[PDB]
Design a protein around this ligand. Structure first.
Ligand code: 9Y6
Ligand code: 9Y3
Ligand code: CL
Ligand code: CL
Ligand code: CL
Ligand code: NA
Length: 129
């Protein structure tokens, strides 16, 4: 599913991300924009052989099982395919664990590089939510 901007914002808020661990909704929308262009089906292979899945490009190195990342962990206790669903629940719940693990949203390098420090409220401006 490719979400619209405001549509994703709404969904994220319904699933409990608005201000989760102190990160406003525009932070989460901005991260999703640059990780996946709001596409739940996004995947990208990392040169080491792990893969990133879904709207928030969650990495099989640590967070999900895809059967093809030697030595990895599955801390969210889910198949990586769950992160590709049109329903964002699995991605949101796993993101809550990631953002809680000590480094906040810096876990998403693209958030650090393209969202952190910017006017992230622009991502939710005007939305009905
Ligand atoms: O963009 C880099 C890699 C993309 C990709 C996506 C799914 C599996 C393998 C590779
Ligand atoms: O507030 C702006 C609406 C959409 C959009 C465009 C670019 C950046 C943020 C959001
Ligand atoms: Cl915001
Ligand atoms: Cl594996
Ligand atoms: Cl933090
Ligand atoms: Na894994």
């Amino acid at each position: 599913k490719v979400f619209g901007r405001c549509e994703l914002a709404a969904a994220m808020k319904r699933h409990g991300l608005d201000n989760y661990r102190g990160y406003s909704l525009g932070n989460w929308v901005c991260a999703a924009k640059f990780e996946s262009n709001f596409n739940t089906q996004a995947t990208n292979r990392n040169t080491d052989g792990s893969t990133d899945y879904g709207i928030l490009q969650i990495n099989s190195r640590w967070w999900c099982n895809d059967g093809r990342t030697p030595g990895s962990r599955n801390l969210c206790n889910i198949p990586c395919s769950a992160l590709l669903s049109s329903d964002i629940t699995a991605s949101v719940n796993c993101a809550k664990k990631i953002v809680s693990d000590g480094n906040g949203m810096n876990a998403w390098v693209a958030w650090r590089n393209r969202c952190k420090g910017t006017d992230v409220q622009a991502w939710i401006r005007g939305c009905r939510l």
